Design a protein around this ligand. Structure first.
Ligand SMILES: Nc1nc2c(ncn2[C@@H]2O[C@H](COP(=O)(O)OP(=O)(O)O)[C@@H](O)[C@H]2O)c(=O)[nH]1
Lengths: 307, 91
């Protein structure tokens, strides 16, 4: 029921939204924001929104976050127009360029001022991309922090550990696309394809509103021990590596199963979460349903308010 | 360009009652693969089994000659939700 919009901001964020449209996420509405008008028109990215027509005459941001932020301030009204009506917005961007690092904080602040649940899902550049890009991404994330409800960062450097031997540069970037998608999907599917333990959107709000920094990981398992093994793989994910989970102010957990989920399995996942979780912690655990699933399970864990 | 995981699936050997399938090594670690098969159009429930994520082949046995089968390989990975790949074959 709750209306979810997904906004890719900038070239990396548009590459992420393009993959999400093609691969499909059920029940969300897609948009791309960019300063580069030619890149906006190249492929199927849902509804497009050009920003910074005055400053950057459709030619891009020149990899400079000051120009991408200036471009965003020009047509705040354009963004407010298309965001209007949503209950939740995911903003996806690769930090460390020009448009994403500078325009994503502004898109986030507009969404907030409409009372929308604003979730940023952003990447940090690979180490081989250089120190300047990484430093840019840090300031844009700090700027982004002022005007979001939750900020999930995906450091691409942690994906290198799970990448195949001899992989291509292109496939490495496409793998980071899949993680952003799996990240939006794992949260949004609690609303768009609920299971028996359907999460109320007001509870999603409690666990993500005005929370600050967040991290997520996931596991998957099949067989008799699918519940405990998927849950432990998620808490052991390399994207949660550096996070002490007992220090999170909120935990949001999505159990994706078919129709065969047993009571002792829902107990088991929750026991696992509640054992580490602090006691001043909002804990929200629901199921989502995937029908083409048999004797298997996915568990997604979002630790919110870790700042 | 294939977009599914795995990106390629082929029968690499075939006997009257068995098929050996091959797929390509994935760009991203796979926990396990889920393989299903059954007679194309049949009324009988599809069969299935899992192989570990570090395998690039599997053997389907117990089949009967001169029957067309549909074979589907799901890749289960914590790092994506990519669609499965599927092929047809007659024993
Ligand atoms: N997921 C994904 N990330 C990318 C892609 N290309 C670049 N990135 C990352 O996103 C960061 C920002 O670059 P980019 O978004 O293209 O700059 P911008 O166009 O000015 O926003 C880069 O430093 C890369 O680490 C892509 O195709 N997919």
């Amino acid at each position: 029921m709750a209306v979810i919009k997904v906004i890719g901001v900038g070239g990396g964020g548009g590459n992420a939204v393009e993959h999400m449209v093609r691969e499909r996420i059920e029940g969300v509405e897609f948009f791309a924001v960019n300063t580069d008008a030619q890149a906006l028109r190249k492929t199927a990215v849902g509804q497009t929104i050009q920003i910074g027509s005055g400053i950057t005459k459709g030619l891009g941001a020149g990899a400079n976050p000051e120009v991408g932020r200036n471009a965003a301030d020009e047509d705040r009204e354009a963004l407010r127009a298309a965001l209007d009506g949503a209950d939740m917005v995911f903003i996806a961007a690769g930090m460390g360029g020009g448009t994403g690092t500078g325009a994503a904080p502004v898109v986030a602040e507009v969404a907030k001022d409409l009372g929308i649940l604003t979730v940023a899902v952003v990447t940090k550049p690979f180490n081989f991309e250089g120190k300047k890009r990484m430093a840019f991404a840090e300031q844009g994330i700090t700027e982004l922090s002022k005007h979001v409800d939750s900020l999930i960062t995906i450091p691409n450097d942690k994906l290198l550990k799970v990448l195949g031997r001899g992989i291509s540069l292109l496939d490495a970037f496409g793998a980071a696309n899949d993680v952003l998608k799996g990240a939006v999907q794992g949260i949004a599917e609690l609303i768009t394809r609920p299971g028996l333990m359907n999460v109320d959107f007001a509870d999603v709000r409690t666990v993500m509103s005005e929370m600050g920094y967040a991290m997520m990981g996931s596991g998957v398992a099949s067989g008799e021990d699918r519940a405990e093994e998927a849950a432990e793989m998620a808490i052991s994910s390399p994207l949660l590596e550096d996070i002490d989970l007992s220090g999170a102010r909120g935990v949001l957990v999505n159990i994706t199963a078919g129709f065969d989920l047993r009571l002792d399995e829902f107990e088991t996942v929750g026991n696992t979460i509640r054992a580490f979780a602090s006691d001043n912690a909002t804990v929200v655990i629901g199921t989502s349903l995937d029908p083409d699933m048999n004797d298997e399970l996915r568990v997604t864990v979002v630790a919110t308010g870790i700042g | 360009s294939v977009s599914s995981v795995p990106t390629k699936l082929e029968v690499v050997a075939a006997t009257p009652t068995s098929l050996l399938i091959s797929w390509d090594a994935p760009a991203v670690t796979v926990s396990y693969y889920r393989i299903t098969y059954g007679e194309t159009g049949g009324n009988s429930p599809v069969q299935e089994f899992t192989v570990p994520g570090s395998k690039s082949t599997a053997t389907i046995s117990g089949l009967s000659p001169g029957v067309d089968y549909t074979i589907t390989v799901y890749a289960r990975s914590a790092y994506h939700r990519r669609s499965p790949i599927s092929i047809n074959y007659r024993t």
